[PDB]
Amino acid sequence: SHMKFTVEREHLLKPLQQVSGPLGLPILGNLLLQVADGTLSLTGTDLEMEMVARVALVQPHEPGATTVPARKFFDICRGLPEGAEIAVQLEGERMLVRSGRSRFSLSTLPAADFPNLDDWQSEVEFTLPQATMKRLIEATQFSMAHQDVRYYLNGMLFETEGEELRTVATDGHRLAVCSMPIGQSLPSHSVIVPRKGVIELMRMLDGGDNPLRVQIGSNNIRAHVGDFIFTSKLVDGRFPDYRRVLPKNPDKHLEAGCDLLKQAFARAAILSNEKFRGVRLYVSENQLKITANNPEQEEAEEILDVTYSGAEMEIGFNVSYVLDVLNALKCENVRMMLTDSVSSVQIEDAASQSAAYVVMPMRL
């Protein structure tokens, strides 16, 4: 009932920044602080997900719990000098923060009022490097839908198969798929992580050598990184099957430099229609021609030297979808695998098949 602790500022700053992620209702604007047997626990939630940080307490402390405004508490700690010792204690309904001759009295809400996610059971468990999880999310995140009526598209599929972890994201117009080996045999499982949960998980990965431990339940996912524990509810519904979305036999193969292709599309985009973003591609022997026009009759034309020996064809695309893919492919060369004017295109790194991108054309 009389919570009290003293911690160095530098052991409090990163945990405060992290747990504040789900934030952006009163109690929802607060962090739950809990002192128990050598541990200070800090929790932030938005009801769909929660972020927890554990800080070891090496100085005398008294057990207890309270909730305090997240932004004000973080700004106070951040604003104190490097190396400051922060003494915190509950005094009635107020939380006191003292360091040097600086005194702050913050308002509180009862710890008993802080919302918790329901108790659940882990079905799947595996550990992987942080960098692998970052690569998986970064390779596909841009392809997620935002606010689509098909709820299951406003998120990302997390799929375990064999020894691989795979991410799939799609909005019904374009799709991104990436898979990585994680050196351990896994059961076959697929879950949809909500888009805000994907963003929170990304932000918790510093790319450091602290490994990431994942636990998957029927209705939840949980990620443990160092002293942090992230938990999110999952999205319901039948996610599309990338195996059926990948073009069956894309016989027309084009190869070109990733940067040269990206820069040509980015310049052509300037004179594309602001609403429809349509660009027209003309493939001929060792040549790609990109054209864009807008309602003012302004026009952009780019001619590129490429590797191409197939039949001549014309195909239209939303240039933002093409640029998104090229921006995600941080490689030297790109391969574009075409079928016809009315069929999707598959785009990938010419040197790696770990990620694949599928874009549906436009009827120009």
């Binding site: 799609t170 117009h173 799709l175 979305v245 999707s344 549906m360 054309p361």
Partner: peptide, 5 residues
């Protein structure tokens, strides 16, 4: 824009 699925 054509639908992918």
């Amino acid at each position: 824009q054509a639908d992918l699925f």
